[PDB]
Design an enzyme around this catalytic site. Structure first.
Site, PDB file in Angstrom:
ATOM      1  CE  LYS A  89     -11.268   5.661 -18.623  1.00 60.99           C
ATOM      2  NZ  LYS A  89     -11.525   7.015 -18.164  1.00 60.99           N
TER       3      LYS A  89
ATOM      4  CG  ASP B 258      -7.473  14.333 -16.018  1.00 66.85           C
ATOM      5  OD1 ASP B 258      -6.804  13.632 -16.783  1.00 66.85           O
ATOM      6  OD2 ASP B 258      -8.577  13.974 -15.544  1.00 66.85           O
TER       7      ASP B 258
ATOM      8  CE1 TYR C 143     -15.797  10.282 -16.076  1.00 66.36           C
ATOM      9  CE2 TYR C 143     -14.534  10.291 -14.019  1.00 66.36           C
ATOM     10  CZ  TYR C 143     -15.370   9.636 -14.916  1.00 66.36           C
ATOM     11  OH  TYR C 143     -15.775   8.341 -14.665  1.00 66.36           O
TER      12      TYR C 143
ATOM     13  NE  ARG D  41      -3.049   0.503   3.149  1.00 63.85           N
ATOM     14  CZ  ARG D  41      -2.540   0.952   4.303  1.00 63.85           C
ATOM     15  NH1 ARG D  41      -2.080   2.215   4.416  1.00 63.85           N
ATOM     16  NH2 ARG D  41      -2.513   0.128   5.361  1.00 63.85           N
TER      17      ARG D  41
HETATM   18  C1  LIG Z   1     -16.069   5.912 -17.737  1.00 64.72           C
HETATM   19  C2  LIG Z   1     -14.983   6.889 -17.359  1.00 64.72           C
HETATM   20  C3  LIG Z   1     -14.622   8.026 -18.122  1.00 64.72           C
HETATM   21  N1  LIG Z   1     -13.644   8.904 -17.648  1.00 64.72           N
HETATM   22  C4  LIG Z   1     -12.859   8.701 -16.623  1.00 64.72           C
HETATM   23  C5  LIG Z   1     -11.803   9.756 -16.273  1.00 64.72           C
HETATM   24  C6  LIG Z   1     -11.233   9.826 -14.996  1.00 64.72           C
HETATM   25  C7  LIG Z   1     -11.516   8.799 -13.863  1.00 64.72           C
HETATM   26  O1  LIG Z   1     -10.663   7.655 -14.160  1.00 64.72           O
HETATM   27  P1  LIG Z   1     -11.002   6.168 -13.567  1.00 64.72           P
HETATM   28  O2  LIG Z   1     -12.167   5.570 -14.174  1.00 64.72           O
HETATM   29  O3  LIG Z   1     -11.255   6.333 -12.115  1.00 64.72           O
HETATM   30  O4  LIG Z   1      -9.792   5.348 -13.820  1.00 64.72           O
HETATM   31  C8  LIG Z   1     -10.300  10.837 -14.749  1.00 64.72           C
HETATM   32  N2  LIG Z   1      -9.977  11.732 -15.675  1.00 64.72           N
HETATM   33  C9  LIG Z   1     -10.537  11.721 -16.954  1.00 64.72           C
HETATM   34  C10 LIG Z   1     -10.159  12.754 -18.019  1.00 64.72           C
HETATM   35  C11 LIG Z   1     -11.440  10.712 -17.232  1.00 64.72           C
HETATM   36  O5  LIG Z   1     -11.990  10.675 -18.475  1.00 64.72           O
HETATM   37  C12 LIG Z   1     -15.310   8.445 -19.379  1.00 64.72           C
HETATM   38  O6  LIG Z   1     -15.347   9.641 -19.734  1.00 64.72           O
HETATM   39  O7  LIG Z   1     -15.835   7.630 -20.168  1.00 64.72           O
HETATM   40  N1  LIG Z   2      -2.440  -4.238  10.715  1.00 61.43           N
HETATM   41  C1  LIG Z   2      -1.134  -4.516  10.018  1.00 61.43           C
HETATM   42  C2  LIG Z   2      -0.687  -3.389   9.094  1.00 61.43           C
HETATM   43  C3  LIG Z   2       0.022  -3.826   7.828  1.00 61.43           C
HETATM   44  S1  LIG Z   2       0.789  -2.326   7.173  1.00 61.43           S
HETATM   45  C4  LIG Z   2      -0.088  -4.662  11.067  1.00 61.43           C
HETATM   46  O1  LIG Z   2      -0.305  -4.279  12.213  1.00 61.43           O
HETATM   47  O2  LIG Z   2       0.998  -5.175  10.825  1.00 61.43           O
HETATM   48  S   LIG Z   3     -18.839   7.667 -16.073  1.00 61.21           S
END
Ligand SMILES: C/C=C(/N=C/c1c(COP(=O)(O)O)cnc(C)c1O)C(=O)O
Ligand SMILES: N[C@@H](CCS)C(=O)O
Ligand SMILES: [S]
Ligand SMILES: Cc1ncc(COP(=O)(O)O)c(CN[C@@H](CCS)C(=O)O)c1O
Ligand SMILES: N[C@@H](CCS)C(=O)O
Lengths: 398, 393, 392, 392
Positions: free
Chosen positions: C205, C180, C108, C55
């Site tokens: 995308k 963006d 968006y 993470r």
């Molecule tokens: C179905 C989604 C579309 N768009 C998404 C989008 C995102 C958000 O990106 P995630 O979907 O969270 O990866 C961020 N930034 C831009 C310029 C985007 O077009 C769409 O338009 O068709």
């Molecule tokens: N609850 C987990 C965190 C993993 S970062 C831990 O205590 O080790």
């Molecule tokens: S969307």
């Protein structure tokens, strides 16, 4: 204007053939059937899938929906009726030949073959009573002369690994039609984008999909394409019983992903290799170069006839012997020292100091490997970077 | 001391410190490997430098899987392949040539039988089937051509057992190589190499994976034999290369093999006790039942009686079909060793196009049902079998 | 120094560090172990080249991040589970109550929803301005303006901002510029080289290119990216990218130049075709000389992109019929896939609204958006041609 | 009702609906297409009855969600990119400026960090109370109290909350109760059946079981989960779970009962062993009769769990020597893997810290936490034994 009976273009089919999102909940990308087994709604429906009545699925070694899409798509691209996906190129080759040959049959072979294909033939199936003969497939008179009543299969690569020797596939097919033999062509180097042996009269094609079809060096895979009858036989005997060379659905899905850019990648591989080949021919240190796109290529007109573009593979000879090749290879900073081909990454092998290093200068000669020989798989990098790398490596080879 | 089975199934052959501390080994999903010099490259194709060049020959993810399986079977070396059939064919193509004979257990997995009779047997290799529990018959069947003795134990359909140590003693007198398909038991329940077998093969598709989502094979044996199978059988004669992705899933499955097998066995023991006293049931084959003909031999070789049950319904083929169709939790499918319980009735499924005399010949009763008992709650599995049995009337 | 294609394939990876593997092994592991407690101690303290938990950071993700940074010309990258993951992790890090964010006039939809119904309901002030109107932007600046955020090109009409012009105003007043860059990718436009502080992507995308992963990217200075990693991602979103998906994204990136060249070549032909058709009232494509910001487009983007917007003369009904008629193009949201996609907001994403509500939100009744794919252009032209006939 | 193991394997899936596939196909697709725009519109309007975009919903994710909902005895499930994704998406949805959240006295570090340095800096009031002290909890309730959030058992004590008692108080005042059920899993404890409204998990831990994915789960009522999906996840975090990782999570869940049985059996043997050793100052394991909340733990948990905490005599120096001597246990953060893990926060996670701030937090100088794995207990006992000798 010209209506709906027009074949969609190669790129369209590479992306879409055989799949409609509406049949899988609207999924744009087909879901991956990473399942070994399939269940039946009733015991009779199950009976039919084993007794050849019901279209369906039961076990992924025999058949799987992800593999089936890959197969149908490859079939479309090669202009064949049916496809079969396998765990490796060797899986495709062995599953095919184990199916088609039995003791007392003869196979006529191209004069040079991929090393493991050679080993399979001579040390594998050829030790089980199958007779082998090598003939120059570029000499149609010699091929005709070598045909015997026992000749069952004619098997070759065009262009061949590693010297790029070619055969007139249509010429071979014509001979085979008259005599009866089944023609099998390893089409790995070209892909269906550059050459379609089935359209020239071959019966079957095989691929190491590990190479250009995948394009990204992350899977091992094989493909067979041909008639429904022959591909079914290979599926149900060669694959099912004789090799077990089952392709992972995960890898089949990666292969399909790669095929979506096949046209674009091959265009760039070929464009880059043409520039490198023209550059290499003009360099002081290069004695000899074999690239199908140069008029110096011994089979230039056959290459132009059969291949839509001259490919991504170059072979050349340095002046200065093994010392030159060693210094050349060790100097490379962008090209990688490795076996394989058709990756996005440019690759080089100097067989004198690498694959055939355990031999002496005499033994490499009868196989046909110069002491300054090097095979390049030209990748997708910026051509100016590849030129710079080769140029500095030539300087170090001097 | 040697760490315990469960410890080895989780840890053997991997130290996180060698891969940047990664608790789970990174997946080498790569077809090729590069060299820092042509000298380094030269050594790998000759086989002096202990590195990598091409994943069909060898790959670090596959190597870990191989080492781990070798440890669990107590063998020197392992080989990973694209399927159980990939394991079997790569093995037999390496060991046999025309004029050699293979002595076979009387019943085999269908595609193993098909490979033998319609594949390698059509290339001049001689086949003979013998009862591998009858040591006098086995000794008498040996000829100078006998080079391999191959069988499953337990074997379909009736879970018939071979005396592995007895077979090995006979083979030793004639130089012959003993190959055991150990798919049903897994190394957790039976280790044929420790009983004197030379090689073991697995459909890792079944219990080793455990989750029905990969196809894979394993070979374990001596370094010299496994090296030949790698470099001839796999490299040249089958190309049955396992995906590193699938090899990683298989290792994931093996981490719970002990726990899963314990539950498969516990569930099958309950179902066998139940089925063995039902009116609809004529015969039952389960190694854990006191009435099992080879109860004693089974307990010598297997630490637990397994997850597989075969039984025969009195009402024959019709009863078999009705039982199968009524199942709601068990799935109608081939395969075995999944979390999900499975059932098949060969007379109406795999061997259905045949007639009754062809099935009896092959050794398949009209009422023979085979169950792969899964990991579901036993009370649910019992309820399903119970209502299916009523429907079979 | 090496070319874009070279860097997209190789940057940040030497096979000799990983057993000669040509393709980097995939670190599909949640945790990493330590040789001693004090080696572990230094990793959590932040002065030890290592890993502890995916993470926070993972070697597969790190390679992806380094390569994306190289392609954008930036110092540092961060990989996240989605484009929204990238945007939210970034803005949650940079903004606190009382700060003002200046926004492009059109965003968006889920970016708009995040700003107005998410972070904007936690005391962060929002204002929209036309980023093409540099006088208006300058007039909108206050000392409390912390962030200027926009897409270029933006939905719906592919409206552009002069990124260097906006950056100049930002430097004058002391604001952070976030762009963006999803539509262009670093292959066509590099906002960091034009004065932006951060770029965000929906890597779902074009960067992926194949429609099989959801992923986000942030690129910018090490200072800013470190804060976004350790606050926005680590604490405020948990939008962790799978190493499996990061590996697939890197696979996609290896053909980014080739794919974008084809998307753009296809879109240019299709746009020129659409411009000549009787059903089409208006077209927004940066590669047409008619595009209002044609000069700025040629200056700021190396190619005009794969996206087309156009308006059908017959409004919402014609839009519906056009969309329903497509056989090769798919009706879908999303963009940048090998497969060509189309959407008509008035009948899809915004269908429940009235016409007047849609006009308030800036969406025409006949507005169709095309993501032009990699299929044969003759096949795409035939599909669009028949669908335009069906639109009447 | 089918049994827990039956449902963990089968719930929500019939092979006949996906071409007979025994294992559900993996929907590794970012988008879904529509047969018509009208069908697509219907998806964005308010209904679902289908699919549009994998950040909102996906069939692989939907199956995982349904199965987790079944195991916890909840109405609805939501899958996210990480445990932190689950927690943040939940709390961002449920809280706004002016609301108060009552917290368990100790929390997971990044949860603590999110609350205090993240959402707490956007005008949400925080207050820590002992969730076993119902009078103290009742006293802390104000009209602004919107959420009660805690782990049970909680680090480092394995301190238990009285979930039914908390829930009674919450329902009177109208507060939502959110329980982090990571340590127990639904196999050992089902807080929804004790009156919690929502449960969250780091599915990275026991649910996965094999240390190879990062993932989060929320389970609760349909009304609450729908909000968290459509606001917290969709707009405020973008913490989208990969279908690949969701499939691996389902794979892990198929053995949850078996794994937890063995984790618990092993942990009990080690805890009983540790209790009899001279190096150990005190030990926190719920299955020991001497555990302060032994009765409450048995009312809520069907088995005492796979986690042990204990203090060495010798403080920090003895902890370091213990940890560095381990040869089978791994020095790592995380828990719930097949591999046994150990950590000593004084010399690992909280090592940059001075011994002063550690003191008033739960973090003792001698405190060691063990995630007891699935290895042979004789090997684990041997490793622990030799490390204790090395600690002296
Ligand atoms: C179905 C989604 C579309 N768009 C998404 C989008 C995102 C958000 O990106 P995630 O979907 O969270 O990866 C961020 N930034 C831009 C310029 C985007 O077009 C769409 O338009 O068709
Ligand atoms: N609850 C987990 C965190 C993993 S970062 C831990 O205590 O080790
Ligand atoms: S969307
Ligand atoms: C024309 C041709 N036919 C078959 C193969 C074997 O395919 P594979 O089994 O997928 O590796 C190959 C593999 N060739 C590689 C092998 C690298 S070990 C090479 O020579 O570079 C091939 O080129
Ligand atoms: N041995 C299993 C699966 C392979 S098809 C069976 O025969 O049912």
């Amino acid at each position: 204007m010209h209506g709906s009976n027009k074949l969609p273009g190669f790129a369209t089919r590479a992306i879409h053939h055989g799949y409609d999102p509406q049949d899988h909940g609207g999924a744009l990308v087909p879901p991956v059937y990473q399942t070994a087994t399939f269940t039946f709604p009733t015991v009779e429906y199950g009976a039919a899938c084993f007794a050849g009545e019901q279209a369906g699925h039961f076990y992924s070694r025999i058949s799987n929906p992800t593999l089936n899409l890959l197969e149908a798509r490859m079939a479309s691209l090669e202009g064949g009726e049916a496809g079969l996906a396998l765990a490796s190129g060797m899986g495709a080759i062995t599953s095919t030949l184990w199916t088609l040959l039995r003791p007392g049959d003869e196979v006529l072979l191209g004069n040079t073959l991929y090393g493991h294909t050679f080993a399979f033939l001579h040390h594998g199936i050829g030790e089980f009573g199958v007779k082998l003969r090598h003939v120059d497939m570029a000499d149609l008179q010699a091929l005709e002369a070598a045909m015997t009543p026992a000749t069952r299969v004619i098997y070759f690569e065009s262009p061949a690994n590693p010297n790029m020797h070619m055969a007139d596939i249509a010429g071979v097919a014509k001979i085979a039609r008259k005599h009866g033999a089944t023609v099998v062509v390893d089409n790995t180097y070209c892909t269906p984008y550059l050459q379609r042996p089935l359209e020239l009269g071959a019966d079957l094609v095989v691929h190491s999909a590990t190479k250009y079809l995948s394009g990204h060096g992350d899977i091992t895979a094989g493909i067979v394409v041909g008639s429904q009858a022959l591909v079914d036989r290979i599926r149900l005997q060669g694959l099912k019983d004789m090799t077990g060379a089952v392709l992972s659905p995960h890898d089949a899905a990666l292969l399909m992903r790669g095929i979506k850019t096949l046209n674009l990648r091959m265009d760039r591989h070929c464009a880059n290799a043409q520039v490198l080949a023209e550059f290499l021919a003009r360099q002081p240190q290069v004695e000899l170069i074999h690239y199908p796109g140069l008029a110096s290529f011994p089979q230039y007109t056959l290459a132009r006839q059969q291949m839509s573009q001259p490919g991504g593979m170059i072979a050349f000879e340095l002046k200065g012997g093994i010392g030159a090749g060693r210094r050349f290879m060790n100097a490379l900073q962008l090209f990688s020292r490795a076996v394989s081909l058709g990756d996005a990454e440019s690759l080089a092998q100097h067989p004198a100091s690498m694959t055939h290093s355990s031999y002496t200068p005499e033994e490499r000669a009868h196989y046909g490997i110069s002491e300054g020989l090097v095979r390049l798989s030209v990748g997708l990098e910026d051509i100016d970077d590849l030129l710079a790398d080769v140029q500095q490596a030539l300087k170090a080879s001097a």
